[PDB]
């Protein structure tokens, strides 16, 4: 049922949160029983606390595969 | 509106293409303008393809050229505008008939061939 519910937002923009404070934004093009995700037109935003101050690191990747072990939340922006 | 006996009339894009080809030939001396010159070309065999003007009045002065083409198996169109054709040729004066001639070693051989093919498609 939850899996089914995620079939609606396929081929449209999504907001995905991973472990390690790694925000991933793109469009949902794939998932399965273990929730392995493939994003197109994507862009990564890496939160990383270093030297006792906040600092984001942007990795621009026009496509990306994501394993289900890392995944926490999927939504729309 | 254009003449019925002027057939095959090109379409717009096709016409444009043909005029471009003509222009190219004019620059490369691989074209001959003028009914009589077209006729000459046909006689020779050098005509690759014949371009006439639909808006020739009195149309009759062309309507041997098509016959000649048929009897020599050279494709042919009419375009609509004799002014346009003339311009393409490189002549301010309005022109009715032109002939893109043959020459194996043209830069524009391929382009010419394309146009020829297109013309043939029209004929039926």
């Amino acid at each position: 049922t939850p899996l089914d519910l995620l079939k609606l937002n396929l081929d449209e923009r999504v907001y995905i949160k991973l472990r390690g404070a790694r925000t991933l934004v793109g469009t949902l093009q794939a998932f399965d029983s273990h929730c392995n995700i493939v994003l197109s037109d994507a862009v990564e935003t890496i939160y990383q606390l270093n030297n006792e101050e906040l600092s984001e690191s942007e990795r621009r990747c026009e496509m990306v595969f994501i394993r289900g072990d890392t995944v926490t939340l999927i939504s729309t922006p | 509106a254009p003449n019925p006996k002027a057939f095959p009339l090109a379409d717009a894009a096709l016409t444009q293409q043909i005029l471009d080809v003509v222009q190219q030939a004019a620059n490369l001396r691989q074209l001959k303008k003028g009914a009589n010159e077209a006729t000459k070309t046909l006689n020779r065999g050098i005509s690759e393809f014949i371009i006439m003007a639909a808006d020739c009045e009195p149309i009759e002065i062309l309507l041997h050229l098509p016959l000649l083409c048929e009897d020599k198996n050279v494709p042919y169109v009419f375009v609509p505008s004799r002014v346009a054709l003339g311009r393409a040729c490189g002549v301010s004066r309005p022109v009715i008939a032109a002939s893109i001639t043959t020459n194996d070693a043209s830069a524009i051989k391929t382009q010419i061939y394309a146009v020829k093919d297109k013309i043939e498609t029209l004929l039926i």
Partner: protein, 90 residues
């Protein structure tokens, strides 16, 4: 089986693989299996510090769990077929 299939379909592919412990390695994918492991031919450089202490290692075997991503381009991967497959499954 969908994802495995997809992986298989990417046989012979120069792709970057970021692992859990700050290891980013490029390589030409060869073999693919049920648990999504990657054997890459011709290991090349991606970054200077993140890329691990290797040199003469031309063939590797990546453990499927330790991969964070498999960095494809927009010209290296399937999408709405995958979606279709997902739909078909429950």
């Amino acid at each position: 089986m969908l994802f495995f299939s997809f992986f298989k379909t990417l046989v012979d592919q120069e792709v970057v693989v970021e692992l859990k412990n700050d290891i980013e390695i490029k390589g030409t994918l060869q073999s693919v299996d049920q648990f999504l492991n990657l054997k890459l031919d011709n290991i090349s450089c991606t970054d200077e510090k993140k890329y691990p202490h290797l040199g003469s290692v031309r063939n590797i075997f990546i453990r499927g769990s330790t991969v964070r991503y498999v960095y494809l381009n927009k010209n290296m991967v399937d999408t709405n077929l995958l979606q279709d497959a997902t739909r078909r499954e429950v």
